[PDB]
Each structure stands twice: as structure tokens, then as C-alpha cells.
């Protein structure tokens, strides 16, 4: 999915594909265009037949163009005021979200029909994919797992109104 190309002093592409496979470093768009044949190339039945079947059954869900973002009440954001300067308190997840947006904007302001240098566009897509992966991983590792996670804290347990705490005496 990552794109990398080298150039000569004159500027000609000089990588020559000496030590890399022909399928590597093609890019995410080439990966989507060549996804079926690549899947047939690299899938090992013995260890991953079930995963390959699951991918076949859900071929529509593999590629998406829209990313969801959950409510801001779950993403704490406080606009505190300080003497030397104002301060903004946010959970790291927000950053990642914002990052994605910025990238897509810089990708959409340039006309997609007009041919542009691949070095300017494809690594941006790869970095967007990395940021989205990190978003999902952070949602699982922070908001949805462990004692802190909403699953164990508030789905099974909960802070209970109409409650009291008392010492005991005979």
C-alpha cells in the first residue's frame, strides 16, 4: 500500500525493481484495482482458508470511502482560559480524527482527474490508512476495554443512584 520511487540525477525512475517484488510498492489504488488476483496469490488455504472465505463473503465491506466519528460528549474537549494563554484539553483520539480530515482536504483540493505526481498523493493515502488503523486501535484500547472500558465499567456495572455507604455496629 505504501508508495516509494527513486530517481536519477537526470530524474528518471531508477529503482529497477532489483530486490522488491513486482506487487510491492504499487500503491493503495493499484491494490484495490488488483485486489482479487493478489488475494489469490498470497492466500494460504492451510492456515487462512476461513479468513479468505470471510473476505469473499464480505467483499463489499472491504473498501470504504466514509469514516465515522463518535459524539464529542464522549471525546472530552474543554476550552479553558489561562493568563499566559488559552488552553484546549482533548483526548488524543481527536487529533487522529482531525489529521484524517486535513489529509483528505489536501487530496481533494487538487483535481483528481488531472494527472499529478504519485509521490505527492499515494503516501498521503497510506498515511491516512495508518491514522485510521490507529483510530480503531485506540477506540478499542481506551474506550472499550478493561476496567476503564465502557464494557466492564458501565455495560455490566454502573454507578448507582439511590445508594448509601455506612459503617456497621452490633
Amino acid at each position: 500500500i505504501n508508495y516509494q520511487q527513486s530517481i536519477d540525477q537526470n530524474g528518471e525512475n531508477i529503482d529497477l525493481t532489483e530486490e522488491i517484488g513486482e506487487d510491492d510498492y504499487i500503491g493503495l489504488v493499484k491494490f484495490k484495482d488488483n485486489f482479487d488476483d493478489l488475494l489469490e496469490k498470497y492466500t494460504d488455504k492451510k492456515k487462512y482458508q476461513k479468513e479468505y472465505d470471510f473476505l469473499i463473503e464480505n467483499h463489499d465491506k472491504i473498501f470504504i470511502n466514509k469514516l465515522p466519528v463518535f459524539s464529542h460528549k464522549l471525546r472530552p474537549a474543554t476550552l479553558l482560559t489561562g493568563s499566559k494563554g488559552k488552553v484546549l484539553a482533548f483526548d488524543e483520539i481527536n487529533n487522529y480524527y482531525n489529521f484524517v480530515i486535513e489529509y483528505i482536504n489536501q487530496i481533494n483540493e487538487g483535481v483528481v482527474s488531472d494527472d499529478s505526481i504519485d509521490l505527492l498523493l499515494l503516501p498521503l493515502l497510506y498515511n491516512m490508512q495508518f491514522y485510521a488503523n490507529n483510530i480503531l486501535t485506540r477506540i478499542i484500547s481506551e474506550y472499550l476495554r478493561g476496567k476503564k472500558g465502557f464494557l466492564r465499567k458501565n455495560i455490566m456495572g454502573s454507578r448507582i443512584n439511590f445508594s448509601a455507604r455506612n459503617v456497621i455496629t452490633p
Binding site: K73, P76, N154, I160, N161, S163, A164
Partner: peptide, 25 residues
Amino acid sequence: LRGLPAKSKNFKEHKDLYSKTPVRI
């Protein structure tokens, strides 16, 4: 903020007489 009960700093600021702190199940 999530609509679920939670502790407040009112007992520390002497705005309340007893803790009013929710128990966890």
C-alpha cells in the same frame, strides 16, 4: 457528561453536608 451518575467536588468545597458519592455495582 455521558448522562450517567458520577461524583462531584461539592463535598470538598463544603457545598454539601454528606458525600453524595455514587456506589458502583
